Write a protein that binds this ligand. Sequence first.
Ligand SMILES: CCCCCCCCCCCCCCCCCC(=O)OC[C@H](COP(=O)([O-])OCC(O)COP(=O)([O-])OC[C@@H](COC(=O)CCCCCCCCCCCCCCCCC)OC(=O)CCCCCCCCCCCCCCCCC)OC(=O)CCCCCCCCCCCCCCCCC
Ligand SMILES: CCCCCCCCCCCCCCCCCC(=O)OC[C@H](COP(=O)([O-])OCC(O)COP(=O)([O-])OC[C@@H](COC(=O)CCCCCCCCCCCCCCCCC)OC(=O)CCCCCCCCCCCCCCCCC)OC(=O)CCCCCCCCCCCCCCCCC
Lengths: 49, 74
Amino acid sequence: LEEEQQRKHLDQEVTDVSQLVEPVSSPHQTEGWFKRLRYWHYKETAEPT
Amino acid sequence: SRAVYAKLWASTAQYTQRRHYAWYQIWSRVIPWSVPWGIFAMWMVFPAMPVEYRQALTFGIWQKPNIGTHGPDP
Ligand SMILES: CCCCCCCCCCCCCCCCCC(=O)OC[C@H](COP(=O)([O-])OCC(O)COP(=O)([O-])OC[C@@H](COC(=O)CCCCCCCCCCCCCCCCC)OC(=O)CCCCCCCCCCCCCCCCC)OC(=O)CCCCCCCCCCCCCCCCC
Ligand SMILES: CCCCCCCCCCCCCCCCCC(=O)OC[C@H](COP(=O)([O-])OCC(O)COP(=O)([O-])OC[C@@H](COC(=O)CCCCCCCCCCCCCCCCC)OC(=O)CCCCCCCCCCCCCCCCC)OC(=O)CCCCCCCCCCCCCCCCC
């Protein structure tokens, strides 16, 4: 039902790169020396008890 | 009970330490193989060392071969 009652951005008409939707994710995340790529999602760290 | 479930969860908390105990057990069974391989190595490089050193590692037992040639000059 959510898929038939919500609107999709790809159904609107845009013409310029400046009008593209802005992501809700923030660019400020991973930090460190010589860390070239600055955005990630998943990791394999063990969960505690 | 929540108390029981907690103790079962914690039973496997020290995974990393138990793997280290595995390291010890296996390396104790393997390390004696260094003696056979060590004897053969010294056995191979023994003749390339000086005469003076060859008599030290054997406590004066080893000596030059006596085959009947290259004796003192009168
Ligand atoms: C008496 C003379 C003595 C002389 C000796 C020197 C004395 C110096 C005294 C200085 C005293 C005052 C300053 C103190 C600063 C202390 C900083 C500190 O400890 O950190 C605090 C604090 C630590 O907190 P933290 O939580 O760890 O934060 C760390 C950050 O998160 C970090 O992560 P982040 O995410 O925030 O940052 C992004 C990250 C990641 O960024 C990236 O990955 C992006 C990279 C983009 C690169 C794109 C390049 C494209 C262009 C390429 C061009 C072509 C090249 C190829 C072609 C080549 C052809 C040949 O960026 C970096 O990794 C930066 C890289 C910096 C490299 C600089 C290396 C310089 C080495 C100099 C030589 C040293 C000796 C070498 C060995 C010699 C032989 C034994 O750090 C900060 O807050 C940031 C400060 C960063 C400062 C960096 C610059 C310092 C410069 C100091 C002066 C040096 C002068 C040298 C010459 C002197 C001539 C006389
Ligand atoms: C019930 C059944 C009974 C049956 C009847 C009985 C059966 C038995 C009868 C046997 C009778 C003898 C038979 C003949 C055997 C000998 C003849 C012989 O065989 O000669 C070889 C024969 C000629 O021999 P040679 O070269 O003229 O011999 C010259 C000598 O070697 C001359 O060598 P060198 O002068 O250059 O060097 C000698 C030197 C060499 O010295 C060294 O290299 C090292 C010396 C320094 C050692 C420092 C050790 C420091 C640590 C000491 C620790 C002490 C602990 C004390 C603890 C006390 C506790 C209370 O040694 C010494 O100076 C004497 C040693 C005195 C020191 C005492 C220590 C000794 C070492 C002890 C080690 C540790 C042992 C215990 C270990 C376990 C416990 C920890 O060669 C041939 O016939 C070659 C034929 C061609 C073969 C072709 C092979 C195949 C080719 C194709 C290969 C490709 C295909 C692959 C095929 C693979 C096939 C598998």
